[PDB]
Structure 1
Amino acid sequence: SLSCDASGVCDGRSRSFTSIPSGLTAAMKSLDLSFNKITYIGHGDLRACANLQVLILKSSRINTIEGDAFYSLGSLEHLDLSDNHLSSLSSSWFGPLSSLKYLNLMGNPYQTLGVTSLFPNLTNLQTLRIGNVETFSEIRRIDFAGLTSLNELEIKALSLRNYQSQSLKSIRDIHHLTLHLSESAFLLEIFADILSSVRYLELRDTNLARFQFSPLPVDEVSSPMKKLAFRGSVLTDESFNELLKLLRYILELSEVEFDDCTLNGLGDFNPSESDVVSELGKVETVTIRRLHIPQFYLFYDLSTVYSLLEKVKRITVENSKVFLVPCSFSQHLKSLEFLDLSENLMVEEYLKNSACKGAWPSLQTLVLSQNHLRSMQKTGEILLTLKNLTSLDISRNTFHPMPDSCQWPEKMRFLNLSSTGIRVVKTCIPQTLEVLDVSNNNLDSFSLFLPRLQELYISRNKLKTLPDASLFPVLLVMKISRNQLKSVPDGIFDRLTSLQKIWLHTNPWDCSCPRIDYLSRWLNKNSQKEQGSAKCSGSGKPVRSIICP
């Protein structure tokens, strides 16, 4: 019942197969037998497809596979056996897969990878995923023997009971290691074994409240780790300080991320300057998303973080209930160039303290997207302290109408006012602008002369008339989809002499011929410039298809 295309890609997915279909051929390049009910794979089921490159067997109900089932798949590059019922793995399955690049064994109920190294013959392996949520409980030294370099290694071990020291040490290089660990018990041992190989370590769902640092029993070496991320972790202010002590081993770390974590303030954590980490090495990017701090009144005089972020260039603290960045802290972020405080609780009065006289000295880009700002004039006035600011994003803030006169940072060339509920644009917006986004608002027209404007985004508004071409003599990009445009003045787009891209779709274009002639002809001569396709109101026919005699 399977169907193959002309390139040997065959689909046998979501059938009710209870066994590998018979009559497979050497012409098959890809076989998808996922979501079936193939309980057993025998000695000869896959012997005929010797040229197979891709074999997907996800979520079928495989519980038994004969040891030599893959003997003729010497050209196989992708094998997905994830989410099946394999409670035991056999080294025999992989012995003949010399061309294998991707192997997914995750989601099967085995407790360990077995007593025999499974991957020594997989010399070309690039991606390996293993483990499960409830049963994988031990990682052994023999587990990764034979593997030298991997682009991605994912180990799901939420129920881990034991990690044999040095298990991960035999791997020479790992570009991205993803570890699902529920407890911090083996973190020091694991960390010690990946110091020479891992370039990006990602730790998921780890409760690190009990984590405590101790120098590692390993020889000194230059670690290639550049990125470290924690996803869904639980920390205490004390354990966080302990984690920072690991930085001494990863001197090239440049980026750190904390997503969906929770930080608990002990309330007794009174560390001396001796045990407190105040240096952050070469970390230049810090990204925090959805951080939950239960009781902030349980933290001490957090001034150590001031010396911690002095060299950081990019900081993101998104959707974490931030309502204030104290002035003294802002003054210490001397190297900061990009600051994103999207989806927080910032209001003008507190932003005024956050952006005090010498705050964020080097700042070039400030994102205050989804906050509680109400006045564009007051916001611009407050930000005059940021002398080097060139880009400002205040989108998704509910602003009252803007006035005719406003003060803004002198170098500001980018301003995002998308989704701010504005009904009119006034001269509050400066002529220094090169990029303006006023999309998703309630605008009925646009008449602002912005001589240096290179990009205008005004999609999702209520314009019934295209803004005058003379308003943007050097415009490169115009986005005006989803408005209420029915026509355009003859020759208008040819007057946008620098135009490179334009979005005109989702508008009720009137394709009656003694009117749509110019637009249809322009679209035919400028297909490269159009993004999306303008369609006629009613028929839904592409505007370009219309030809007026």
Structure 2
Amino acid sequence: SLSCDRNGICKGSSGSLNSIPSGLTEAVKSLDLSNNRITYISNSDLQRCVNLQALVLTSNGINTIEEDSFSSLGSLEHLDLSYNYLSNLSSSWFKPLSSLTFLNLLGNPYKTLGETSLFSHLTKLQILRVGNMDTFTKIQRKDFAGLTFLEELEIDASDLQSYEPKSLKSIQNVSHLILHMKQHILLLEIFVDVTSSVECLELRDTDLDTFHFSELSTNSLIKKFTFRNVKITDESLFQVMKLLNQISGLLELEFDDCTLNGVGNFRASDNDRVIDPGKVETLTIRRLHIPRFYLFYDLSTLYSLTERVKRITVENSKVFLVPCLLSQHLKSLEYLDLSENLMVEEYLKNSACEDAWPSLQTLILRQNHLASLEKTGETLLTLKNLTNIDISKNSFHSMPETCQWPEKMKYLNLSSTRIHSVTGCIPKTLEILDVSNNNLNLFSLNLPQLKELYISRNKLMTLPDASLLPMLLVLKISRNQLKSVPDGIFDRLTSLQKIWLHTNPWDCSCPRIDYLSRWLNKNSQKEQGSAKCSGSGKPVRSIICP
């Protein structure tokens, strides 16, 4: 019915509640009545919850809340009324909430935030979420009256129809503004009011296929502009970039789950010259969709705009070519993440043409279609500054006796590559090596500089030799088939700080487990997790021998 813990954290999980339970007291610290059938909130339901710090009523279907229902909740810090049936909000609900830090009103069918300012008394408010998908159609200038500083403001303006000018300009500082909006009609009229107050701007759900930029009635404080679930065409992209051109200090541009398509027979004619890269140094593209029946587009002229970009992530976005032309324009690129794409070694060699990627130090090709460890090593050889190489989750299966790798390489990730053994293919220059989640039985490579070895989720029968890994700081060797370890082994690793030994079938026979059980107790702070004995589920740490 209503289950609490020893410290007043209460939750109503049954879902068969028709009203707020009776007999709530000053000992209730948190009240989670999510996903119940509560319909009414009277002035007496919560009068004795003077110590209530969090009140969650998500997805209940609350019709009405009496004016003074929250009169006693002066210590409430977290109020979630999202997804109920409140079509009319009263400023008297929030007047007593002097300690309120989080307020969520999303998903309630109000057309307006009322004719009286709701948040004038929330002097401590930090996170405000407001709006809905269907009926929220007006933003008024009074709506955000007494709010000067907010950490996060989320406005679901999905079907907003009108925006009263300067409604949002009253908020001086907003670290993160999230704006849902299916159409772009109101986009530029909201932008002028928040461009000077927002640090991280996020636009969600908007259809920008036919977006056109027009000069603004206006410097900007936005450092990051995120587009999520947004639709863009090759034509409207140049308009979007003109909007980004108004943000002189923009550092980071991010497209998550967006859609890119052609308008049909569009060409780059005069937009090419009038585009300034600005100070954008990080580009992040995730899960870019291209319509199933797409119209072809050619945005190769945009390759030349990347000369100053330092950090690029293009994840899970159907990349099977990175042309040499593009890679040669990427003169400042230090970090490239191409995870979850369709790159094959053959075309990766074109990407590494002469004078390609001079500054690149980190290359991530996790979960592409890479097949040969050798060809990959030779492909990356001409990238002289490459130090971090992640080629995990590629079905390599095996490695030859000897390989070529970039000379400065110090981090190599061979996780989830389906290998059954390791060879000298792995260079001695490595400081960090990950060979987790494979099918290794042995690891006996001489890596005199290796600081960190990750080798969990294998079939290791014996610990690697400590003489071969002198400088080891970290050894993650959990989830193997280790039964014992040579006595005195860990004193050999003078620099050892963290070690994972759990999920191994440790033999806890006293004439053998003595050293390990003792070492664990003296070094409990080094062990991550706790090694258990095979038969009994008792920690090896708490095993003493005569």
Using structure 2 for the length normalisation, give the TM-score.
0.96
Alpha-carbon deviation of 1:205? 1.6
Structure 1 CA distance, aligned partners of 2:42 and 2:273? Answer: 60
Alignment equivalent of 1:445, drawn from 442, 447, 465: 442
Relative distance call for 1:297 and 1:409 in structure 2 (3 A) is farther
Relative distance call for 1:400 and 1:58 in structure 2 (3 A) is closer
What is the one-letter code of the residue matched to 2:474? V
Structure 1 CA distance, aligned partners of 2:241 and 2:389? Answer: 32
Query: 1:203-218 counterparts in 2 under 5 A?
Result: 203-218=203-218
Alpha-carbon deviation of 1:114? 1.6
Q: 1:160 aligns to what?
A: 160
Alignment equivalent of 1:269, drawn from 266, 275, 291: 266
Alpha-carbon deviation of 1:4? 4.5
What is the one-letter code of the residue matched to 1:525? K
Structure 1 CA distance, aligned partners of 2:79 and 2:88? Answer: 17
Q: 2:64 aligns to what?
A: 64
Residue 220 of structure 2 is aligned to residue 223 of structure 1: yes
Q: 2:200 aligns to what?
A: 200
Query: 1:454-493 counterparts in 2 under 5 A?
Result: 454-493=451-490
Contact 1:278 1:305 survives alignment (8 Å)? no
Alpha-carbon deviation of 1:6? 4.7
Structure 2 CA distance, aligned partners of 1:540 and 1:6? Answer: 28
Residue 518 of structure 2 is aligned to residue 518 of structure 1: no
Residue 429 of structure 2 is aligned to residue 432 of structure 1: yes
What is the one-letter code of the residue matched to 2:502? H
**Structure 1: runs of 5+ lacking an equivalent:** none
Contact 2:397 2:420 survives alignment (8 Å)? no
Alpha-carbon deviation of 1:402? 1.4
Contact 2:263 2:295 survives alignment (8 Å)? no
Alignment equivalent of 1:342, drawn from 336, 339, 353: 339
Residue 371 of structure 2 is aligned to residue 374 of structure 1: yes
Structure 1 CA distance, aligned partners of 2:261 and 2:159? Answer: 24
Q: 2:42 aligns to what?
A: 42
Alpha-carbon deviation of 1:15? 5.7
Query: 1:238-257 counterparts in 2 under 5 A?
Result: 238-257=235-254
Contact 1:36 1:59 survives alignment (8 Å)? yes
Alignment equivalent of 1:315, drawn from 312, 317, 331: 312
Structure 2 CA distance, aligned partners of 1:279 and 1:473? Answer: 52
Task: Classify the secondary structure of the residue corresponding to 2:36.
Answer: coil
Q: 2:296 aligns to what?
A: 298
CA deviations on 1:62-84 (whole Å, 9 max, x unpaired) are 11111122122222221111121
Relative distance call for 1:157 and 1:401 in structure 2 (3 A) is same
Aligned identity (percent) is 72
Task: Classify the secondary structure of the residue corresponding to 1:185.
Answer: coil
Q: 1:233 aligns to what?
A: 230
Task: Classify the secondary structure of the residue corresponding to 1:323.
Answer: coil
CA deviations on 1:422-464 (whole Å, 9 max, x unpaired) are 1111111111100111111111101110000001111111111
Alpha-carbon deviation of 1:399? 1.2
Structure 2 CA distance, aligned partners of 1:296 and 1:406? Answer: 42
Alignment equivalent of 1:495, drawn from 492, 495, 518: 492
Task: Classify the secondary structure of the residue corresponding to 1:298.
Answer: coil
Further displaced range: 314-323 or 396-405: 396-405
Using structure 1 for the length normalisation, give the TM-score.
0.95
Structure 2 CA distance, aligned partners of 1:346 and 1:6? Answer: 55
Task: Classify the secondary structure of the residue corresponding to 1:256.
Answer: strand
Task: Classify the secondary structure of the residue corresponding to 2:312.
Answer: strand
Contact 2:234 2:263 survives alignment (8 Å)? yes
Task: Classify the secondary structure of the residue corresponding to 1:385.
Answer: coil
Structure 2 CA distance, aligned partners of 1:306 and 1:509? Answer: 56
CA deviations on 1:30-65 (whole Å, 9 max, x unpaired) are 333333322111223222223332222222231111
Q: 1:91 aligns to what?
A: 91
Structure 2 CA distance, aligned partners of 1:372 and 1:12? Answer: 48
Q: 2:410 aligns to what?
A: 413
Contact 2:202 2:228 survives alignment (8 Å)? yes
Q: 1:22 aligns to what?
A: 22
Task: Classify the secondary structure of the residue corresponding to 2:174.
Answer: strand
Further displaced range: 113-122 or 208-217: 113-122
Query: 1:97-246 counterparts in 2 under 5 A?
Result: 97-218=97-218, 222-246=219-243
Structure 2 CA distance, aligned partners of 1:419 and 1:23? Answer: 55
CA deviations on 1:215-272 (whole Å, 9 max, x unpaired) are 1112xxx211111111111110111111010123211111111111110022322242
Alpha-carbon deviation of 1:2? 4.0
Structure 2 CA distance, aligned partners of 1:189 and 1:110? Answer: 22
Contact 1:125 1:150 survives alignment (8 Å)? yes
Residue 518 of structure 2 is aligned to residue 507 of structure 1: no
Alpha-carbon deviation of 1:277? 4.7
Relative distance call for 1:277 and 1:448 in structure 2 (3 A) is farther
Structure 2 CA distance, aligned partners of 1:547 and 1:111? Answer: 70
Q: 1:397 aligns to what?
A: 394
Q: 2:381 aligns to what?
A: 384
Structure 1 CA distance, aligned partners of 2:50 and 2:111? Answer: 32
Contact 1:179 1:202 survives alignment (8 Å)? yes
What is the one-letter code of the residue matched to 2:522? K
Alpha-carbon deviation of 1:210? 1.6
Task: Classify the secondary structure of the residue corresponding to 1:152.
Answer: strand
Task: Classify the secondary structure of the residue corresponding to 1:381.
Answer: helix
Task: Classify the secondary structure of the residue corresponding to 1:258.
Answer: strand
Contact 1:86 1:110 survives alignment (8 Å)? yes
Q: 1:258 aligns to what?
A: 255
Structure 1 CA distance, aligned partners of 2:498 and 2:129? Answer: 42
CA deviations on 1:141-188 (whole Å, 9 max, x unpaired) are 221111111101111222222222322121111111111111212111
Structure 2 CA distance, aligned partners of 1:47 and 1:315? Answer: 54
Task: Classify the secondary structure of the residue corresponding to 1:199.
Answer: strand
Alpha-carbon deviation of 1:274? 4.4
Contact 1:241 1:277 survives alignment (8 Å)? no
Task: Classify the secondary structure of the residue corresponding to 1:307.
Answer: helix
Alpha-carbon deviation of 1:18? 2.5
Alpha-carbon deviation of 1:512? 1.6
Further displaced range: 436-445 or 56-65: 56-65
Further displaced range: 472-481 or 166-175: 166-175
Contact 1:255 1:284 survives alignment (8 Å)? yes
Q: 2:325 aligns to what?
A: 328
CA deviations on 1:66-104 (whole Å, 9 max, x unpaired) are 112212222222111112121111112112222211111
Contact 2:238 2:271 survives alignment (8 Å)? no
**Structure 2: runs of 5+ lacking an equivalent:** none
Structure 2 CA distance, aligned partners of 1:487 and 1:160? Answer: 66
Contact 1:113 1:143 survives alignment (8 Å)? yes
Contact 2:358 2:383 survives alignment (8 Å)? yes
Task: Classify the secondary structure of the residue corresponding to 1:79.
Answer: strand
Contact 2:9 2:29 survives alignment (8 Å)? yes
Structure 2 CA distance, aligned partners of 1:276 and 1:180? Answer: 32
Structure 1 CA distance, aligned partners of 2:275 and 2:461? Answer: 58
